[PDB]
Amino acid sequence: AVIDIDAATKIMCSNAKAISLNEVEKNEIISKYREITAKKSERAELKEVEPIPLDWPSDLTLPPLPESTNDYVWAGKRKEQLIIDGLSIVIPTYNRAKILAITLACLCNQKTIYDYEVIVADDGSKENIEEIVREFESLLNIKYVRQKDYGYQLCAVRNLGLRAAKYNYVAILDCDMAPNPLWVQSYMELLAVDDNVALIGPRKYIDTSKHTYLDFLSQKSLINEIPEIITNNQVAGKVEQNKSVDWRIEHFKNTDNLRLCNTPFRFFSGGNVAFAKKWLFRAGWFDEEFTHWGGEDNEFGYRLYREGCYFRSVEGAMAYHQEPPNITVQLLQQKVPYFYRKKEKIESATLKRVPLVSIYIPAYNCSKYIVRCVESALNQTITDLEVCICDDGSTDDTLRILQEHYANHPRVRFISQKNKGIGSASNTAVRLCRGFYIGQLDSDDFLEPDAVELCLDEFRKDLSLACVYTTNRNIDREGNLISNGYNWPIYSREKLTSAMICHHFRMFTARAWNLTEGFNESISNAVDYDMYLKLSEVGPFKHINKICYNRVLHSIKKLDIQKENHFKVVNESLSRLGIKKYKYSPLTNLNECRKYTWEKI
Amino acid sequence: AVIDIDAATKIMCSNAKAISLNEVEKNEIISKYREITAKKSERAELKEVEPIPLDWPSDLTLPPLPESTNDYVWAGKRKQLIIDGLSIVIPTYNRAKILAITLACLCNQKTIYDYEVIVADDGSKENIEEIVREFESLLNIKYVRQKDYGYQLCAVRNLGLRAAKYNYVAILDCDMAPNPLWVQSYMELLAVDDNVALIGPRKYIDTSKHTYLDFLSQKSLINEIPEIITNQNKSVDWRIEHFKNTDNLRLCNTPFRFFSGGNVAFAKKWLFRAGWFDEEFTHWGGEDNEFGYRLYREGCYFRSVEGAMAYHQEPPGKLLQQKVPYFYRKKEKIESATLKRVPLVSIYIPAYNCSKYIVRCVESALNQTITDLEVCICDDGSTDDTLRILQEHYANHPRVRFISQKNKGIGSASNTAVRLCRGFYIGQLDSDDFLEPDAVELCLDEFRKDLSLACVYTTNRNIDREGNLISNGYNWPIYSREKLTSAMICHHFRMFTARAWNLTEGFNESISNAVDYDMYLKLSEVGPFKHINKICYNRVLHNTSIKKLDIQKENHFKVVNESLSRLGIKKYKYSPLTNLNECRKYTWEKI
Numbered sequence A: 001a002v003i004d005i006d007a008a009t010k011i012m013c014s015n016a017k018a019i020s021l022n023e024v025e026k027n028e029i030i031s032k033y034r035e036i037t038a039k040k041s042e043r044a045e046l047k048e049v050e051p052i053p054l055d056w057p058s059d060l061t062l063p064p065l066p067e068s069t070n071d072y073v074w075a076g077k078r079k080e081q082l083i084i085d086g087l088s089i090v091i092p093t094y095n096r097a098k099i100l101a102i103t104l105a106c107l108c109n110q111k112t113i114y115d116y117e118v119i120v121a122d123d124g125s126k127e128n129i130e131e132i133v134r135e136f137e138s139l140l141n142i143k144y145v146r147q148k149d150y151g152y153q154l155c156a157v158r159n160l161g162l163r164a165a166k167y168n169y170v171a172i173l174d175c176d177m178a179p180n181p182l183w184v185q186s187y188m189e190l191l192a193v194d195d196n197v198a199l200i201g202p203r204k205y206i207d208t209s210k211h212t213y214l215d216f217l218s219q220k221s222l223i224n225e226i227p228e229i230i231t232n233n234q235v236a237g238k239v240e241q242n243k244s245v246d247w248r249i250e251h252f253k254n255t256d257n258l259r260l261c262n263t264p265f266r267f268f269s270g271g272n273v274a275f276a277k278k279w280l281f282r283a284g285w286f287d288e289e290f291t292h293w294g295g296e297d298n299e300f301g302y303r304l305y306r307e308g309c310y311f312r313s314v315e316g317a318m319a320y321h322q323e324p325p326n327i328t329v330q331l332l333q334q335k336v337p338y339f340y341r342k343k344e345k346i347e348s349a350t351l352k353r354v355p356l357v358s359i360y361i362p363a364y365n366c367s368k369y370i371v372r373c374v375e376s377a378l379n380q381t382i383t384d385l386e387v388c389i390c391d392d393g394s395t396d397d398t399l400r401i402l403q404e405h406y407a408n409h410p411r412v413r414f415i416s417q418k419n420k421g422i423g424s425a426s427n428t429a430v431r432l433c434r435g436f437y438i439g440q441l442d443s444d445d446f447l448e449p450d451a452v453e454l455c456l457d458e459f460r461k462d463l464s465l466a467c468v469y470t471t472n473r474n475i476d477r478e479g480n481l482i483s484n485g486y487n488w489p490i491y492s493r494e495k496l497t498s499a500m501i502c503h504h505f506r507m508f509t510a511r512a513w514n515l516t517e518g519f520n521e522s523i524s525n526a527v528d529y530d531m532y533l534k535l536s537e538v539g540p541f542k543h544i545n546k547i548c549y550n551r552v553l554h555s556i557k558k559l560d561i562q563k564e565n566h567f568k569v570v571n572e573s574l575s576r577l578g579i580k581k582y583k584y585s586p587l588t589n590l591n592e593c594r595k596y597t598w599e600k601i
Numbered sequence B: 001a002v003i004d005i006d007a008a009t010k011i012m013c014s015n016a017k018a019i020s021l022n023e024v025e026k027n028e029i030i031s032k033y034r035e036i037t038a039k040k041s042e043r044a045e046l047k048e049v050e051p052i053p054l055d056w057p058s059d060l061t062l063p064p065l066p067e068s069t070n071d072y073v074w075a076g077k078r079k080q081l082i083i084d085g086l087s088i089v090i091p092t093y094n095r096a097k098i099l100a101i102t103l104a105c106l107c108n109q110k111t112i113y114d115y116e117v118i119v120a121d122d123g124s125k126e127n128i129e130e131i132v133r134e135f136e137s138l139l140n141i142k143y144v145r146q147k148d149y150g151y152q153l154c155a156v157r158n159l160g161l162r163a164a165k166y167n168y169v170a171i172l173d174c175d176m177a178p179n180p181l182w183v184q185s186y187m188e189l190l191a192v193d194d195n196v197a198l199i200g201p202r203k204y205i206d207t208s209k210h211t212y213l214d215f216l217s218q219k220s221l222i223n224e225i226p227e228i229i230t231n232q233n234k235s236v237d238w239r240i241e242h243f244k245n246t247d248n249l250r251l252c253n254t255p256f257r258f259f260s261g262g263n264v265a266f267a268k269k270w271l272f273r274a275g276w277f278d279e280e281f282t283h284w285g286g287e288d289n290e291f292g293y294r295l296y297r298e299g300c301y302f303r304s305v306e307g308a309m310a311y312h313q314e315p316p317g318k319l320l321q322q323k324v325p326y327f328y329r330k331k332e333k334i335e336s337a338t339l340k341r342v343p344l345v346s347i348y349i350p351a352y353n354c355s356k357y358i359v360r361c362v363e364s365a366l367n368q369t370i371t372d373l374e375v376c377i378c379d380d381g382s383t384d385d386t387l388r389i390l391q392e393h394y395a396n397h398p399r400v401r402f403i404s405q406k407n408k409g410i411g412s413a414s415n416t417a418v419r420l421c422r423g424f425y426i427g428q429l430d431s432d433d434f435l436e437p438d439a440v441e442l443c444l445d446e447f448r449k450d451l452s453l454a455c456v457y458t459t460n461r462n463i464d465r466e467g468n469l470i471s472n473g474y475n476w477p478i479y480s481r482e483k484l485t486s487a488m489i490c491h492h493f494r495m496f497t498a499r500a501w502n503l504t505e506g507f508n509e510s511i512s513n514a515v516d517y518d519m520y521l522k523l524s525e526v527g528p529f530k531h532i533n534k535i536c537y538n539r540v541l542h543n544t545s546i547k548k549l550d551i552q553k554e555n556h557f558k559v560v561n562e563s564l565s566r567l568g569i570k571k572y573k574y575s576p577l578t579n580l581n582e583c584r585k586y587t588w589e590k591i
């Protein structure tokens, strides 16, 4: 032999090539994998303690957490000016002019206080769409965008309009989705209060066939009067017809309009939605790689979620789908890791467009202990992950080593930058990660073969979890054991705002991270505590009591005053919670002391 | 019952009003101003020195400044982008036959970069869609349309630019038939340096005799057709004469004057940075010229390309002053003065607990020999009432604008105050200090005398927190970059070009002190400085600094210099010649 890349990854690339590597080889490598990721994290010393420090004030109560990952009421509380100009409404159209007409009519009948433009988006229609639009030029503040015919390009056309949209609030409407008179108002009135929430309107099905667009401009309510169509469903051999309905509405009333749902994107359907345009630049636009089978909605909604955008249902946004003359799970799979992606076995397992996990690593001068650091994650029971490193202007071979090692690794990705400190390094690396579950791994340390896996099981139990940390063992730079890391048994916010109990190896929901101000780039240290204190405000944490992190154990007078300094700021900075009646002051005037006192002000 | 604002402004807010003020009420106000501003800055002590620090390494030569504010070659040297392609927004209004010919010419483009054609239709009566729809199987053509609500050129240009999907855009009046090497000539340059906007030359020709089809088969006809006389010996792009003297503008200092939305190409990033086209316009110009100005102010460069020739087809039987002070603005007197929309000058004041000395500050800016000036104050999360003072003082002032943010250092307040300013000439004014009534004028003069000039600065005399004049401020007789890179010789009052600033990284929001020395150092690289040897600044002198902080002060200092490691200097390090903390003596260690 000589040198190489992990077997974990080796197998996936093999399972990929349509030309089967000889079983004899494949097996030999799989085994080598199985044995290198065989050890199991060893549980830790079972302790016993005071959940919420007694010293903790009995008049102080941190702002209650959110009741789910999409709880927008709680998001509303989070205090923290905007321009409420108008609502650019994009209507994707492929022929059906006589219908776009009706939809344009029901858009003339809008009783709202907001300015709204209608952007008819034509994706290479055959019928003459511009003819229609011109007819309305005298009623709506209408615009027309067109792209040539090159297939089914809804995502592409959706993008044109949204691009053409001039306001800060966009809305999307299939050309067959006739809004009700209160559509604009309903969306806008909510987008004006919270712009971090993507309103989703419901729908009903109507056979608008017996009418022309004139009937609607006339009867400015006719749209709410036309009977919902009926469906001839086949139930076990014999026919059963019922009133076709929006399958989502049932779910809407059972989640308080998705305020409690932990997977709102499952209901996001671009045929009638509204949101702040800023999100397009944050989570991207509709994926044009999607064919007519769909998935683009969920996949888009997912990325909205992964950034921190919320989801909400509006009844005032009811749209009417005009009657046109199964296995979605296999469509997301690749681009939506979170809820949908299920584990494959190394044998049949294969690389993923978007990894389920992203191990970020801030690296500065971690010369020799960095190739050990990266393989400690590439060699994990969870094969569906990636490693993103950020060279913080190392003054040593670090970066050079990363290249002659990972410059072509399908599962590793780095980025160099001029040294800006540890707070930054991270932001840069985290931003590099494309996965939903994100863990921390410093340069000189290294993990345990099932660290990531162990955390992953905890996220799956409570999809409300924002973070999950394990415990660690203090290690010799050389690699020798010399202690077991501090391990506070149970997690609670109070204990956190009293002492840094988030032992190392941490894992957080990218969405949760995005709901935070990110890493603090102006402090020499206390970076971890800050980030994780910030996280505690976003959601609950879960601690596993096993040793999954091997940490190297690596104080000149003046310095110290900084450390003490930083530590207390962090807790104070947590004024974010709108807490001003107290203050976490030191109790002593010593450097290495951490004893604190809740002095009132 | 009496109590109000200030003079100069008072008048301006009048000369504007539509009710003739009793010349009496007025007059006195005018004397107020005159005597309140009739003072002039006394010359500064005369010193004799040696221009370049005699310690300057012979083998150290500072990278040469640009030859003109728009020297894109220099810019080029200084120092992965996604070169997706070109988005060509073609503003259309009928002339459907001409469009067809133009589109036909874009079909014959010989280039390697990918491109798209967005037809921006501003209320055409004719069937533009038909023409677009015709060129579908030849061009990636998108077609956008807005209703006829008048002459909305800018409007439509923006609609299209918004619809652009690539990182590079281009505009071409519906009748501007591009030459075969157009798209290429632009991308070629755009891919190497996206901080320079490309201006294309034109030619007027007769097109009626043809049909868009001719140009499709005769891929080389638009070049053979004869120039005519549009409404010498024929009609010629007046700009072309200038394009060959200024070395394609590389030497021009008012490049925004040759900017046409009929034939240009630039990095879309600019729309997002200098603003889009100003829809507040009517039937003619100003836009091309005003948008270009803004670009200019945001550090953009203008370079006329030749290969981007375009042919202006002949039609069938068919304002600025407010927003542009750098060139056109005319220093007009007070009694007939006014409030210009876009100001010519802006004064930024980082504020932090200056409650006791702030009104005295802001005021002085207004009470200047200059009328077209503004003040942009940024309260850096003051603890005291600073903010309230400002509020109930200028919360309505038609020449003052302020803002609040949690205290984050001086390097931040600046980057925020300056980022707030709207004028072209920016001057620094510290809260507790106060300027002389003619300092914005003096500086303003020097700038008039030279446009290569990036910054002009005077000198000052120190003051007692209260007002008692203490000692006269330091003064280096003559400027030079080599000197500033050896010790802060850039005294206080300091005015620099908005553009200059924009060519820099702004203030350092990470250093307790030296910020000042870091900006004018960052600036000294972008352009030349002029030094007015007259006292125009009165700065308070606040006392006792305990050793510890004095330990970082000297630290920052040196860092600032070295930090000017952007000049690509790798062999020298500006180190100390003493471990003492308040010492500033240096040595050039050859590394």
Ligand SMILES: CC(=O)N[C@H]1[C@@H](OP(=O)(O)OP(=O)(O)OC[C@H]2O[C@@H](n3ccc(=O)[nH]c3=O)[C@H](O)[C@@H]2O)O[C@H](CO)[C@H](O)[C@@H]1O
Binding pocket: A092, A093, A094, A123, A151, A152, A153, A154, A157, A173, A174, A175, A176, A269, A270, A271, A272, A292, A293, A294, A295, A297, A321
């Ligand atoms: C009520 C509902 O479940 N609506 C969704 C459903 O559409 P539907 O299954 O209701 O079919 P549909 O034809 O109404 O959806 C087509 C929508 O896409 C447009 N179109 C169609 C063909 C074309 O070549 N270009 C084009 O832009 C057309 O303008 C219309 O707005 O499934 C789609 C999957 O893509 C979208 O997620 C729709 O929002």
Ligand SMILES: CC(=O)N[C@H]1[C@@H](OP(=O)(O)OP(=O)(O)OC[C@H]2O[C@@H](n3ccc(=O)[nH]c3=O)[C@H](O)[C@@H]2O)O[C@H](CO)[C@H](O)[C@@H]1O
Binding pocket: B091, B092, B093, B122, B150, B151, B152, B153, B156, B172, B173, B174, B175, B202, B260, B261, B262, B263, B283, B284, B285, B288, B312
């Ligand atoms: C190459 C050139 O010399 N261009 C400038 C010159 O054009 P011209 O004097 O040649 O004016 P023009 O008749 O070519 O019209 C200018 C452009 O505006 C468009 N248009 C016209 C009327 C309308 O209601 N909507 C509309 O979009 C039209 O398609 C054309 O693209 O002077 C104008 C003053 O405003 C513009 O600065 C043009 O950029």
Ligand SMILES: O=c1ccn([C@@H]2O[C@H](COP(=O)(O)OP(=O)(O)O)[C@@H](O)[C@H]2O)c(=O)[nH]1
Binding pocket: A361, A362, A363, A364, A365, A366, A392, A419, A420, A421, A422, A425, A426, A442, A443, A444
């Ligand atoms: O300017 C820096 C300094 C440190 N680090 C990294 O931040 C982590 C923590 O710092 P270090 O090991 O030096 O001490 P630690 O902070 O680990 O206790 C390690 O990844 C360092 O490699 C960094 O990215 N940039």
Ligand SMILES: O=c1ccn([C@@H]2O[C@H](COP(=O)(O)OP(=O)(O)O)[C@@H](O)[C@H]2O)c(=O)[nH]1
Binding pocket: B349, B350, B351, B352, B353, B354, B380, B407, B408, B409, B410, B413, B414, B429, B430, B431, B432, B542
């Ligand atoms: O946290 C601060 C501290 C000061 N300043 C402003 O910084 C400028 C210079 O501050 P300082 O007084 O320290 O500078 P000096 O007056 O000492 O030159 C003054 O206008 C202050 O009002 C600020 O914006 N933020």
Ligand SMILES: [Mn+2]
Binding pocket: A174, A176, A321, A324
């Ligand atoms: Mn449909």
Ligand SMILES: [Mn+2]
Binding pocket: A442, A444, A445, A552, A554
């Ligand atoms: Mn370490």
Ligand SMILES: [Mn+2]
Binding pocket: B173, B175, B312
């Ligand atoms: Mn013209």
Ligand SMILES: [Mn+2]
Binding pocket: B430, B432, B433, B540, B542
């Ligand atoms: Mn001061």
